[PDB]
Amino acid sequence: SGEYPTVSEIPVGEVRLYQIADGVWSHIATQSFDGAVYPSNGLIVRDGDELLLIDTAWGAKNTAALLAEIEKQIGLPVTRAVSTHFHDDRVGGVDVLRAAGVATYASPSTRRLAEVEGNEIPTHSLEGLSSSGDAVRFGPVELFYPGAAHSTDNLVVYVPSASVLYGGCAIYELSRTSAGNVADADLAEWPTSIERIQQHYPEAQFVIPGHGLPGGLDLLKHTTNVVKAHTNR
């Protein structure tokens, strides 16, 4: 609760946690590219007496700090992590997680793409997500493959107990009014994929983008608007 952490509050290589609801936090880290600093969010979901992590904190150093920060602020073991797509902001740091005894998971689609890209590859495979609209339970969350959007493999994560939808990088914060990196995106399918998310999680109360400030379900329509504008450039 209180003010959501921004790059302001986060020195290079450090991580802040933010409690969204009982037993649900986001993690916020920063990375430089092209002379600008960007924030990046992931999720932490309490799983009985242990923790499920969604996404790395974008690199080995940040990910080591994330674990130290969890160890300091929450004090429960991270037993499993899921990466929501193959790019380095989601899997960069997987080796760090693995060395700390976290079981790292991604879909076969993400694992294959990470391999092709020369990125870190989560060890464990998540079955049953290969077709658009597929959902699978994973402890205290549901994993959902809405179809291609920011990437062909992107997953979204819902915490049914707290009504928290984590859209990852397929969903943009309201402040982002122009598309980010779309090299790997399927612009043609992105709005349909968003429509699947909307139809599957109409009860979501909190929506967390890959980057920047949380909001509500309006972030889905906002993303659609931004992607369509880019499509029509």
Ligand X SMILES: O=C(O)c1ccccc1CCn1c(-c2cccc(OCCN3CCOCC3)c2)n[nH]c1=S
Q: Output the known binding site for Zn(2+).
A: 85, 87, 89, 124, 150, 169, 211, 222
111, 134 contact by CB (below 8 A): no
Q: One symbol per residue from 144 to 173: x for binding ligand X (CB under 6 A), - otherwise; what is it?
A: -------------------------x----
Of 2-10, 83-91, 122-130, 139-147: span binding ligand X (CB under 6 A) = 83-91
Contacted by 139, from ligand X, Zn ion, none: CB < 5 to 8 Å by type = none
Q: 34 catalytic, yes or no?
A: no
Q: 41 catalytic, yes or no?
A: no
Is 89 a binding residue for ligand X by CB under 6 A? The answer is yes
For residue 87, the minimal CB distance to Zn ion (Å) is 3
Contacted by 136, from ligand X, Zn ion, none: CB < 5 to 8 Å by type = none
Of 21-29, 30-38, 85-93, 135-143: span binding Zn ion (CB under 5 A) = 85-93
Which of 27, 47, 55, 89 is catalytic? The answer is 89
Which of 47, 62, 87, 119 is catalytic? The answer is 87
Q: One symbol per residue from 98 to 137: x for binding Zn ion (CB under 5 A), - otherwise; what is it?
A: -----x----------------------------------
Contacted by 69, from Zn ion, ligand X, none: CB < 5 to 8 Å by type = none
For residue 124, the minimal CB distance to Zn ion (Å) is 6
Q: What is the C-alpha separation between 146 and 195, in angstroms, rounded?
A: 8
Q: What is the C-alpha separation between 80 and 40, in angstroms, rounded?
A: 20
Angle between helices 190-200 and 218-231 (to 10 degrees): 170
80, 102 contact by CB (below 8 A): yes
Residues lying near ligand X in the complex (CB under 6 A): 33, 38, 87-89, 169, 180-181, 210-211
Catalytic annotation, residues: 85, 87, 89, 150, 181
